[PDB]
Paper text:
The T-cell receptor (TCR) recognizes peptides bound to major histocompatibility molecules (MHC) and allows T-cells to interrogate the cellular proteome for internal anomalies from the cell surface. Here we explored these issues using phage display to generate a high affinity TCR derived from the MEL5 TCR specific for the heteroclitic version of the [name]*0201-restricted primary melanoma antigen recognized by T-cells 1 (MART-126–35) peptide, ELAGIGILTV (A2-ELA). This TCR, α24β17, bound to A2-ELA with an affinity 30,000 times stronger than the natural parent MEL5 TCR, resulting in picomolar levels of binding. Remarkably, although the enhanced affinity was mediated primarily through new TCR-MHC contacts, α24β17 remained acutely sensitive to modifications at every position along the peptide backbone, mimicking the specificity of the wild type TCR.
We next explored the possibility that Ala substitutions could impact TCR binding by altering the structure of the unligated A2-ELA molecules. We reasoned that, if α24β17 TCR binding required a conformational shift in the peptide, then more energy would be required to reach the same final bound state, thus explaining the lower binding affinity. To this end we solved the atomic structures of A2-ELA1A, A2-ELA4A, and A2-ELA8A at 2.1, 1.9, and 1.9 Å resolution, respectively. Molecular replacement was successful in space groups P1, C121, and P1211 for A2-ELA1A, A2-ELA4A, and A2-ELA8A, respectively, and the resolution was sufficiently high to show that the structures were well ordered and contained well defined electron density. A comparison of these Ala mutant structures with the unligated structure A2-ELA showed that each mutant did not substantially alter its structure when in complex with TCR. These data discounted the possibility that alterations in the unligated conformation of the Ala-substituted A2-ELA peptides could explain the sensitivity of the α24β17 TCR to these single peptide mutations. Collectively, the structures demonstrated that the α24β17 used an almost identical binding strategy to engage the Ala mutants compared with the native A2-ELA and that the Ala mutations did not alter the peptide conformation of the unligated pMHCs.
Numbering used by the authors:
A (entry chain C): 1 to 10
B (entry chain B): 0 to 99
C (entry chain A): 1 to 275
Amino acid sequence: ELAGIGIATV
Amino acid sequence: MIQRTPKIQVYSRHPAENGKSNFLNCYVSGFHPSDIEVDLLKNGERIEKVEHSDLSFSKDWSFYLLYYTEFTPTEKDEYACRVNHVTLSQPKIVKWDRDM
Amino acid sequence: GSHSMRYFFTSVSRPGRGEPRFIAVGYVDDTQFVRFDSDAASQRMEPRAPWIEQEGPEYWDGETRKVKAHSQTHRVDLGTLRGYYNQSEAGSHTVQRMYGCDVGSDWRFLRGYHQYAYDGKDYIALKEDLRSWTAADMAAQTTKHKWEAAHVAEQLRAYLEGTCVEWLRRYLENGKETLQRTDAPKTHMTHHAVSDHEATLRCWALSFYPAEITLTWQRDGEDQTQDTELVETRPAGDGTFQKWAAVVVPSGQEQRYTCHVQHEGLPKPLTLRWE
């Protein structure tokens, strides 16, 4: 599964 | 900008046997940026319905792609792969060599 | 032995020629199982492995959701990074993200990873502790600052230590015939004259899985790594891999040379000889 949290803009 | 030159490999999926169906592959790896043009050629003519893998990349961030088509080899038919990329001053054509 | 799950994301800006291109792919070890392409018709995460096709609608809907959210954040990033590096609007630029987890032969967690590149160079990367960042230049320090204040490392640790490992276990089980296999290489050496006094010796490994392999030439026991041409491991297209290594040697000396092959599916490392 892909991450649902923690993928943030730079 | 970083630029990395594609490494081009043309080869069959299984050991080639004249008259027996097979797959012709052109693998391009180690390249950057991603914009690239790859054609499989039969006697210098572009083969339509070549399929390709989805853009992925290595630990070093360089990209790779597999182009492929089903084919049956013969004694006279010459196969190649033609690649263009910003790092090449003209398209590079790699001939399929069945006796490597 | 060991397994991994890794997701790969590429966004490419294309000023005047549309919104950025976004491609995502998921792998278990060397087996692709999902893709998303922003330019395809479906606008859906799609199966690329037979064994993933079992997953139900909640799955595909969820994974389409999240993948598009990844895409829209990378689209923002392209604009941001232009600002950080004072670059022009006219140039095409590339953002890359990869994250995932490795488990050992007992399917226990070894480590997690989450790394990001801008224009083909490291940008920022989560350290092995899963609590701190390695920022590879001054702009990336700005990102580090914002991600520290936003507690992003803690969110990723939770996914990487838990969810990632749980689903990787699920997939390994569901795809077990494809994924929990070893296909040992089929090996041989070819010999061709290049002239009157030199021959090319090429050591082949074929039909193997997984892709990790070592091919090496020795002359009288000594590694020839400086004079060896080693091609990149390449897909056959059927789930297996191929590789070769070649040296050009003086005619009459073939018997000094041996090829050595190392792969997980070999009961022992192999030595091929010209005698």
